[PDB]
């Protein structure tokens, strides 16, 4: 430490600040300074990686993520962000392992999010049964996550388990957020439980956006 | 069933019986009969794998571990055993991946052993802090693990955190079982404290006896 930690952490925040803005170029200055104080600064490298990840420089980003991991091997936040990065580069098998390593930290406040990601990566790898188990782990840690509930509902609707699916969809409805997809599910669900009211009520399809989406089309045909 | 799955599980038990009894080669016959009944039996392949691994036919053991995992790649018990094999074969990176997956079965009765292996593998990958985390989780699932307490004591001793180290060492001592390595630690640990009694009491190093061990040499050069 030697007070250096404070100085380093400050340069990092300053760097993150510029990042949260979009001035990826200016952020580098403070981050590089933090790095001069602590060459093995996990956060410094991690921050620096998000920058390169932003400037569309996957190669440098990946390099910086590895550098961060080479210090705080038990840094769930970085592991999780790297997993998100790996997910974009479509390197699923690797994302899965990083996220799976991130979930080991039982104290990480966002551990429930880590399980969500693991579920999302399992879907892309064509492993529904595995994804469902992870989405469940996520709700097991915090039932109040509408996005995770939406994924549970969709997975259940496809197995034709309409009752538990509706239950999870309602858990997702209490969030107010809705997209073309979640709306088509709600309609299809309300249609199963003979709820012609709520079904039509989701007129948010035609208007309220998504007027020319596939979901809106399916709605028309199945209507 | 056709009573076929009945005889299959019986043959596995017989095989595991010979295996546990020390008649390794003998285990093959029963396990082979089980494979003829169900050429895709994960348990049969798993057990046969252990036979080869015991006979130090690593290549053969690997093929059976893989075949076992082809059935269900989420088999915590086989995933752990394979992981231990990989550790023994110095294949740390693959070991870690396998064990990480095995850790996801929170219902696995021997889940503590998985975390114990993750600690061991972490040490070989030069990641002490991360290893410490896994050993803690292991002890939390099972306090009755002198060998894991030992690893903690050593890891802690090297970080110069003597108090918690001696605390883990005493738990290890309650396991009634010492060796050259543990004797040398218990001594260096009793010296840090005002216990020149137990330090000498560990004369077992000299007689009874590793009189020709490295530990014993370092012991005299540190009296």
């Amino acid at each position: 430490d030697k007070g250096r930690d404070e100085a380093r952490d400050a340069y990092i925040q300053l760097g993150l600040g510029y990042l949260q803005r979009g001035n990826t170029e200016q952020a580098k200055v403070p981050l590089r300074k933090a790095l001069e104080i602590d060459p093995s600064s996990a956060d410094a490298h991690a921050a620096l990686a998000v920058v390169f990840q932003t400037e569309m420089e996957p190669k440098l980003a990946d390099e910086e993520y590895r550098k961060a991991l080479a210090s705080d091997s038990r840094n769930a936040r970085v592991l999780n962000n790297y997993g998100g990065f790996l997910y974009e580069q479509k390197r699923y098998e690797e994302a899965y392992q990083r996220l799976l390593e991130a979930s080991q930290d039982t104290l990480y406040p966002e551990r429930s999010r880590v399980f969500e990601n693991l579920g999302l990566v399992s879907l892309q790898m064509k492993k529904p049964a595995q994804a469902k188990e992870y989405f469940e782990k996520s709700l097991r840690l915090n039932r109040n996550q509408p996005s995770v509930a939406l994924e549970m509902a969709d997975l259940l609707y496809k197995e034709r388990e309409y009752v538990p699916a509706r239950q999870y969809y309602d858990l997702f409805a209490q969030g107010g957020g809705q997209n073309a997809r979640s709306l088509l599910l709600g309609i299809r669900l309300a249609k199963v439980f003979e709820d012609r009211d709520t079904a039509a009520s989701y007129g948010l399809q035609l208007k309220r956006l998504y007027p020319g989406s596939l979901e809106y089309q399916e709605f028309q045909a199945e209507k």
Side-chain angles (χ1 to χ4, degrees), chain A residues 1-206 210-223:
Chain A
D1 191 299
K2 202 185 71 63
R4 313 301 290 300
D5 278 2
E6 283 167 290
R8 179 201 53 178
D9 291 352
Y11 279 119
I12 300 298
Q13 263 177 287
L14 182 57
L16 299 175
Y18 284 155
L19 209 176
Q20 262 284 171
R21 249 53 236 177
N23 310 65
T24 67
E25 196 63 68
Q26 288 174 297
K28 298 178 177 173
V29 181
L31 294 174
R32 289 297 175 180
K33 279 180 183 181
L35 242 16
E36 295 166 55
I37 310 302
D38 183 340
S40 71
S41 178
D43 289 344
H45 284 299
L48 205 57
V50 187
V51 178
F52 291 133
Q53 190 189 310
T54 303
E55 297 179 352
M56 254 69 98
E57 301 315 316
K59 254 62 174 51
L60 302 181
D62 182 81
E63 209 208 318
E64 280 304 315
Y65 270 130
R66 266 87 135 64
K67 294 194 182 175
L69 272 53
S71 188
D72 277 353
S73 53
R74 191 47 44 190
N75 197 321
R77 194 206 108 231
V78 175
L79 254 357
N80 179 67
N81 281 173
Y82 187 24
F85 164 67
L86 292 173
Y87 185 76
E88 311 178 329
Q89 301 302 122
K90 289 182 173 52
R91 293 202 257 150
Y92 310 132
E93 265 166 43
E94 304 174 66
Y96 182 65
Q97 282 147 176
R98 299 303 185 163
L99 292 175
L100 198 58
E101 187 174 356
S103 70
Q104 298 307 315
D105 181 352
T106 65
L107 270 15
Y108 185 46
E110 302 301 88
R111 179 149 134 85
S112 63
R113 193 204 285 187
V114 172
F115 283 119
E116 170 169 38
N117 294 332
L118 272 167
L120 292 170
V121 178
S122 293
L123 292 171
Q124 290 291 161
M125 288 175 82
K126 315 304 159 53
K127 300 172 180 296
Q130 173 173 302
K132 179 170 174 177
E133 188 165 293
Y134 286 119
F135 289 139
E136 283 171 349
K137 292 190 174 193
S138 189
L139 295 163
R140 229 86 74 53
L141 264 39
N142 185 12
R143 265 274 183 154
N144 311 120
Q145 307 180 72
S147 55
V148 179
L150 173 57
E151 299 304 314
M152 268 309 286
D154 201 43
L155 250 43
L156 290 166
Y157 171 81
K158 295 180 183 182
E159 304 180 313
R160 290 192 301 168
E161 287 197 51
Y162 308 120
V163 176
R166 190 186 175 194
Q167 168 192 161
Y168 278 107
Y169 185 90
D170 282 36
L171 183 68
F172 148 88
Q174 289 287 283
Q178 287 273 195
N179 42 42
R181 172 212 187 186
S182 58
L183 293 166
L184 184 45
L185 213 197
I187 296 174
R188 281 169 168 165
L189 247 34
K191 264 200 166 299
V192 181
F193 302 79
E194 304 171 355
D195 188 327
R196 278 297 179 62
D197 264 43
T198 303
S201 179
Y202 280 129
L204 301 66
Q205 282 286 60
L206 196 171
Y210 326 116
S213 73
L214 280 58
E215 355 256 342
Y216 175 66
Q217 284 288 293
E218 311 182 47
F219 169 61
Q220 302 285 53
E222 287 151 35
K223 194 165 64 183

